[PDB]
Design a protein around this ligand. Structure first.
Ligand SMILES: Nc1cccc2c1CN([C@H]1CCC(=O)NC1=O)C2=O
Ligand SMILES: [Zn+2]
Lengths: 1091, 370
């Protein structure tokens, strides 16, 4: 088995964040760690400026900046989970931005048990060393090229937290440690010249039983602040100050930040999302934020909430409390999909178009996330105007800076619409013709308007509206093609071309030429620092099929590209993306050619083809968020944008667009007038990016999700935390989805202080509103959820697998299988089947219901009497958490990667154990790829694939795929977000918000790409100089085997990104059959289409 | 309360004192292939850590171990799938720790005390001219896994370390597995795979057998603890082999708890239906647990389980102190009332002041958890 794994959506969750002067000793920087990703920013004081976004070959564990003595800016230390240590410097020179490795190595010990409270990466204030607590009972020291390291035997094994003390002649570390006697704070002096530890400056003072964090406080204070559950203590030898505020009792302080560089103000943060200010001791509650993983104070009053459970934030710390009393106000919310605990692919909106709905986030940050491939349009006006052949915005008032007019072209006709705010009205523009189809019109030079029709070129004055000039072809022949800017016009009359200039009350015929063939399309867009005057005319011709760059006014040929084919160019456009000049040429067949253009020579380089529609594409330029874009109108409307100096094409979610133009009116600001075959729509464009994310906050934990088409709704299992009140029940912490349901219901019992309440939510597949909420029983933990039809019955039921959880019980002794019918906006309970265990998983099996009751696998039959009837029972000796199926074969999965294959015998009415595997390792998810293969997520962020003559051979499974993903997969799902090279498609949702795609490959394609990977790795420069082969190596505390049966899609896709002479280097002798660079472009292009 | 010295059985005094002691330890690398001798008359299964007393008197077995002392000091003990057809796919290495040579009655005789070390997989059983076999075996590695949460927590919440202490165990679950919220499983599920948790669930029954147990004696390590517990469970050979295949301490404790809960009544293997004793009568008269391997004067190893009350037993002959495995107690042969199957012995105190005044030493081969 050979598979392909690629990132569909990068990780979104924030793992850590820092502030310093990395880019320049002037610019205030904010560095965000999104696992494998590093986001570098500048604090704009009027926003947040994104400079660069680099990806690494490791999961970031440590990320702290440092400036050792004489340095131009800051040096960044990064330590990966695989112990990849590196020092990175920022390097900028014009448009080129590159991260530079100053020192790198691997600090992993030949032996040792990785410590309980994770990896700790601390730096001496004077930049004298790097302190690492990776293993219990040792202290690794890296003095700040090959990153040389040494250990110091630390006597106190169980270290909670540690920091490098400030104001020291000799480096000192202060750490909270725990022994059987108690939990006490201690100090040690680290000597480099002695390579060992010596007694600390002060005594081993006893601290709070739950003392969790050590805060390194600067001069003139010195010493350390120890944060516990109820107490905040301070130690400095003889100087001691112990405060116990009741305001911090509720939740534990998990993260801090320094506000004043001297050490007088600290930002504290607890697990519930509260924000505290530790003043220098006094604590004050500022307000509520997202559940912060990390906090960063930056500039004046602005704060960055780095969240992992929910959307990250930008918040303001006003000294003035509002009506509610909060000193915290929410500026900007940054989408975080992580964690994805469940998900499903549904054909919402249009069939064939895949959409991904996920159970994302936790607790108050709980939400549903809808991820749709492609940009969207927000409609504001809709007018019935069929068969529009052209659209143009106008400003009838020269004094006004906004559009107040919209000119429409039709078959031998022209209509004019006036925009009186939000009101669109049919009017007539004086000077313009209504009886002729228009090729162009708009605002031109010397406060005038132009109208190019099939008959003439009309120049109209703005005060008053009247005809000033009118150009016609000498023999009164019709204008075929037309291009116009502000001061220039180039028109075609078959083979003939005419160049005119727009002067006051005059259209001046500068030059004219005859072409080799009939003119198909024209463009005179002024590019670069060309003040409204273009010295280039881009032209497409019939029969010879060519894109030609001509010089104005001479009409002299500079370049002629031979497009090839019988299909003639329909649209041609000169454009500028990310300061780079391009030529865009659309063909009648739907194909689009794109090259880079040299403004001086007129040379077309780096020819690239892209298939858009089936219809001839029409290219119109538009400005979105102070950036130039190209809207490609076809039956697959697309936006042509720029990202890392490479053109990106993202589909617009619209059935078809024929013509469009941008409209900035008083009623419709920074809008797009879009036309199809039947109607004119006026609206706004979303964010220009590949995928779209709709956030449906639940304000509670979503756990499981599935879909019912017959009901046009989603079934969602969700839990809310409620505290025990002074009554025989519980009270909520805040309103949430399950509380605020349209119609509410509760389970009726028949079976024999912070509580978790479980609910089945019913959410409409359009609005996403809580139509219904069925609250489960007291102490009932809802586990599995499935939407299916069973037996002979034609009604689709929502089935839930529960478990009765009590603190005394270890393994749930009770559970239910609850059958619900969703009709009349309420859930009718059809069947309540009590089982002697936890219903960990359920699946529809060929018309029956397969469910797992702890260690047993039951098959239930749906009778006429509408009650699930026990058929056959397989007793597994392994807990059946995972339960997946394909035909008459079942997959059983344990948390310890103990897989066993079952098969239901139709004639026998029993289960037959095909093959089993028992390789202890934590398993988080598992999916069936095909009849013989199956994919799973194994411990230490890895993926794997198990495959299927003698009885001993056939009864034992074979591990054919091993891969270090770098992510913790929670869900696998068969589907695709896109409307053959590869076999099948499995999407995966991770803890960090990363979505991925896994597909199958042929023996040949696998080897082709595996060979290509090794070659690509010899070219590509790695951040921190980490070997790709190492990063992808299957890794656990024990074995670290190289990756097998897997292709890194993310590495293979960066072939389309490398320089063309480097592509040539990679393809040189690649292959036996020979491999062309243009062949490998097609193969790799094809693979980018899967997602 | 019991006054008997629970250390006395573990030290195999009947074997005699004044034995040559060996300290030095040999351990073979994991997955490594080794060729180890097998003792022709050992038919029991040894668990790693379990003490195996031997009394050898056959010239070939005597010469074998005599030569063994000069080198490795380790031999292989096979877990027989079919004891009659001498079929074994698994086993454990045994390292000699106590040794003694005697010459008597015209023969050269040797007494050893060995301990289970490393489990193995049988590759081939070659045989020698003198009768003693050799086994090409592959060492099975002990598979140690990190916390279930270790992978999911690479964050700020990491620095949350581990009657009346009932709430401690709930606070422990709530704290340790808090990050289960990031996953698709609840904290109570993760506890079913927590080594510390599963150990406490086992320790719960280990205190029901050892009323005078001090936690200092018990191993902190789940590897040692899972094994110690396996060696004192009165279960059939089919079930013991299944436990020996287990590579993880977690999988083992989970298996052991399952056995411990289903364990109710112990019957006569021969009758199948005659009930002899129950789980409630089981008690640890030794530190090794309620069950241990002991040798009779003819080298036959009887793994005996200590119970306070037994039932369909009939005794024969008068008590004897000769070669007693529990010093201060006299044994008398006990058999099934129905079929006459030798079930073990009734141990009766030789002094009025001893506690317990009587108990039963039942041989696990005679028993059936049916
Ligand atoms: N005397 C004699 C002769 C033949 C077999 C056996 C014995 C004594 N014995 C057992 C009796 C119980 C004990 O505590 N130690 C033993 O050694 C036998 O299994
Ligand atoms: Zn009997």
């Amino acid at each position: 088995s050979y598979n392909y794994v690629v990132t569909a959506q990068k990780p979104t969750a924030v793992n850590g964040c820092v502030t310093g002067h990395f880019t320049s000793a002037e610019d205030l920087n904010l560095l965000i760690a999104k696992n494998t990703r590093l986001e570098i920013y500048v604090v704009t004081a009027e926003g947040l400026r994104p400079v660069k976004e680099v990806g690494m070959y490791g999961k970031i564990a440590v990320m702290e900046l440092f400036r050792p003595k004489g340095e131009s800016k800051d040096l960044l230390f990064i330590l990966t989970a695989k112990y990849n240590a590196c020092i990175l410097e920022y390097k900028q020179s014009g448009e080129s931005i590159d991260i530079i490795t100053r020192a790198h190595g691997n600090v992993q010990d030949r032996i040792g048990r990785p410590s309980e409270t994770g990896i700790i990466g601390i730096i001496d204030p004077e930049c004298r060393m790097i302190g690492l607590r990776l293993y219990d009972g040792l202290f690794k020291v890296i003095p700040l090229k090959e990153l040389k390291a040494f250990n110091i035997r630390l006597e106190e094994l169980h270290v909670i937290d540690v920091k490098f003390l400030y104001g020291c002649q000799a480096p000192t570390i202060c750490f909270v440690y725990q022994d059987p006697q108690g939990r006490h704070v201690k100090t040690y002096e680290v000597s480099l010249r002695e390579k060992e530890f010596n007694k600390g400056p002060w005594k081993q003072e006893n601290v709070e039983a739950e003392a969790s964090m050590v805060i390194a406080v600067p001069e003139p204070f010195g010493g350390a602040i120890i944060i516990g559950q109820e107490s905040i203590t301070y130690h400095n030898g003889d100087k001691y100050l112990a405060i116990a505020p009741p305001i911090i009792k509720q939740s534990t302080i998990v993260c801090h930040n320094r506000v004043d560089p001297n050490g007088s103000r600290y930002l504290l943060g607890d697990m519930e999302g509260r924000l505290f200010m530790l003043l220098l001791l006094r604590v004050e509650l500022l307000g509520e934020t997202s559940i912060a993983e990390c906090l960063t104070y930056l500039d004046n009053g602005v704060v960055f909430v780095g969240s992992r459970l929910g959307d990250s934030q930008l918040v303001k710390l006003n000294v003035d409390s509002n009506e509610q009393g909060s000193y915290v106000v929410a500026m900007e919310t940054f989408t975080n999909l992580g964690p994805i605990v469940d998900m499903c692919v549904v054909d919402l909106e249009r069939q064939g178009q895949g959409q991904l709905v996920t159970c994302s986030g936790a607790f108050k940050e709980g939400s549903l996330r809808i991820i749709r491939n492609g940009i969207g349009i927000h409609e504001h006006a809709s007018i019935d105007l069929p068969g529009i052949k052209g659209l143009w915005p106008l400003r009838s008032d020269p004094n006004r800076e906004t559009d107040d007019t919209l000119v429409l072209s039709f078959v031998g006709q022209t209509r004019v619409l006036m925009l009186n705010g939000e009101e669109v009205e049919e009017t007539e523009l004086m000077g313009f013709v209504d009886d002729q189809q228009t090729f162009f019109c708009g605002n031109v030079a010397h406060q005038q308007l132009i109208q190019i029709t099939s008959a003439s070129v009309r120049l109209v004055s703005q005060e008053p509206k009247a005809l000033v000039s009118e150009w016609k072809e000498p023999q009164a022949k019709n204008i075929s093609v037309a291009s116009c800017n502000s001061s220039q016009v180039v028109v075609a009359v078959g083979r003939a071309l005419y160049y005119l200039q727009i002067h006051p009350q005059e259209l001046r015929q500068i030059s004219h030429t005859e072409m080799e063939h009939e003119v198909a399309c024209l463009d005179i867009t002024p590019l670069g620092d060309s003040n409204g005057l273009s010295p280039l005319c881009a032209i497409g011709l019939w029969t010879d099929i060519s894109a030609r760059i001509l010089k104005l006014p001479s009409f002299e040929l500079l370049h002629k590209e031979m497009l090839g084919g019988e299909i003639i160019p329909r649209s041609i456009l000169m454009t500028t993306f990310e300061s780079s000049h391009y030529l865009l040429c659309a063909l009648g067949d739907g194909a689009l050619f794109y090259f880079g253009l040299n403004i001086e020579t007129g040379l077309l380089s780096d020819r690239k083809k892209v298939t858009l529609g089936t219809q001839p594409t029409v290219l119109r330029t538009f400005r979105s968020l102070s950036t130039t874009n190209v809207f490609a109108c076809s039956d697959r409307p697309t936006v042509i944008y720029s990202s890392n100096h490479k053109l990106v094409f993202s589909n617009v979610n619209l059935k078809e667009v024929n013509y469009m133009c941008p409209l900035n009116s008083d009623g419709y600001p920074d809008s797009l007038a879009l036309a199809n075959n039947s109607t004119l729509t006026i609206g706004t464009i979303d964010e220009i990016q590949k995928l779209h994310i709709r956030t449906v906050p639940l304000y509670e934990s979503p756990r499981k999700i599935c879909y019912q088409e017959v009901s046009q709704c989603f079934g969602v299992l969700s839990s809310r935390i409620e505290v025990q009140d002074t009554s025989g029940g519980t009270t909520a912490l805040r309103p949430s989805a399950s509380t605020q349901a349209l119609s509410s219901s509760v389970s009726s019992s028949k079976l024999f202080e912070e509580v978790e309440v479980h609910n089945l939510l019913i959410i409409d597949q359009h609005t996403f509103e809580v139509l219904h909420a069925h609250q489960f029983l007291q102490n009932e933990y809802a586990l599995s959820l499935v939407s299916c039809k069973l037996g002979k019955d034609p009604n689709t039921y929502f089935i839930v697998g529960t478990a009765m959880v009590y603190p005394e019980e270890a393994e749930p002794k009770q559970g239910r299988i609850v059958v619900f019918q969703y009709s009349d906006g309420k859930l009718q309970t059809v069947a309540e089947k009590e089982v002697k265990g936890a219903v960990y998983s359920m699946v529809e099996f060929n018309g029956k219901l397969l469910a797992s009751i702890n260690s047993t696998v039951r098959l239930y039959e749906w009778t006429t009497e509408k009650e699930l009837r026990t058929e056959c029972n397989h007793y597994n000796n392994i807990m059946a958490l995972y339960l997946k199926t394909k035909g008459d074969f079942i997959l059983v999965g344990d948390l310890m990667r103990s897989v066993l294959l079952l098969a239901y015998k139709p004639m026998e009415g029993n289960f037959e154990e095909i093959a089993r595997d028992f390789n202890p390792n934590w398993m988080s998810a598992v999916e069936i790829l095909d009849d013989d293969n199956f994919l799973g997520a194994e411990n230490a962020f890895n993926l794997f694939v198990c495959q299927k003559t003698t009885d001993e051979e056939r009864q034992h499974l074979q591990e054919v795929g091993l891969f270090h993903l770098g992510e913790f997969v929670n869900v696998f799902c068969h589907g695709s977000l896109v409307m053959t090279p590869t076999q099948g498609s499995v999407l995966f949702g991770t803890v960090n918000g990363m979505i991925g795609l896994v597909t199958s490959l042929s023996e040949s394609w696998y080897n082709l790409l595996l060979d290509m990977q090794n070659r690509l790795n010899k070219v590509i420069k790695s951040v921190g100089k980490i070997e790709h082969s190492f990063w992808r190596s299957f890794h656990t505390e024990r074995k670290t085997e190289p990756a097998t049966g897997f292709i890194d899609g993310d590495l293979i896709e960066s072939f389309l990104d490398i320089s063309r002479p480097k592509m040539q280097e990679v393809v040189a002798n690649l292959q036996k059959r020979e491999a062309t660079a243009d062949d490998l472009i097609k193969v790799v292009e094809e693979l980018t289409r899967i997602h | 309360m019991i006054n008997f010295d629970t250390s006395l059985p573990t030290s195999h005094m009947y074997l005699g004192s004044d034995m040559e002691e060996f300290h030095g330890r040999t351990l073979h690398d994991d997955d490594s292939c080794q060729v180890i001798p097998v003792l022709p008359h050992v038919m029991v299964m040894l668990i790693p850590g379990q003490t195996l007393p031997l009394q050898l008197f056959h010239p070939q077995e005597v010469s074998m171990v005599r030569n063994l002392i000069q080198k490795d000091r380790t031999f292989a003990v096979l877990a027989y799938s079919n004891v009659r057809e001498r079929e074994a796919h698994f086993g454990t290495t045994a390292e000699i720790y106590a040794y003694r040579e005697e010459q008597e009655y015209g023969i050269e005789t040797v007494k050893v005390k060995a301990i289970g070390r490393q489990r193995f997989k049988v590759l081939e059983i070659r045989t020698q001219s003198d009768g003693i076999q050799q086994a090409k075996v592959q060492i099975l590695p002990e598979r140690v896994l990190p916390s279930t949460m270790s992978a999911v927590q690479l964050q700020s919440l990491s620095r949350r370390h581990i009657r009346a202490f009932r709430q401690w165990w709930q606070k422990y679950q709530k704290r340790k597995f808090h990050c289960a919220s990031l996953t698709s499983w609840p904290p109570w599920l993760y506890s079913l795979y927590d080594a510390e948790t599963l150990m406490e669930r086992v320790k719960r029954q280990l205190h029901e057998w050892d009323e005078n147990l001090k936690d200092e004696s018990l191993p902190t390590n789940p590897i040692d603890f899972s094994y110690r517990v396996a060696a004192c469970l009165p279960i059939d050979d089919a079930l013991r082999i299944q436990l020996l295949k287990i590579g993880s301490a977690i999988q083992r404790l989970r298996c052991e708890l399952d056995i411990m809960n289903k364990c109710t009544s112990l019957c006569c293997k021969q009758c199948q239906d005659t009930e002899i004793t129950t789980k409630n009568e089981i008690f640890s008269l030794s530190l090794c647990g309620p069950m241990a391997a002991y040798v009779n004067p003819h080298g036959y190893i009887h793994e005996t389980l200590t119970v306070y009350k037994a039932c369909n037993l009939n005794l024969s002959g008068r008590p004897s102190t000769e070669h007693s495995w529990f010093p201060g107690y006299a044994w008398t042969i006990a058999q099934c009332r129905i079929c006459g199957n030798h079930m073990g012995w009734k141990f009766t105190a030789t002094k009025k002041d001893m506690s317990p005044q009587k108990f039963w030493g039942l041989t696990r081969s005679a028993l059936l958890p049916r």
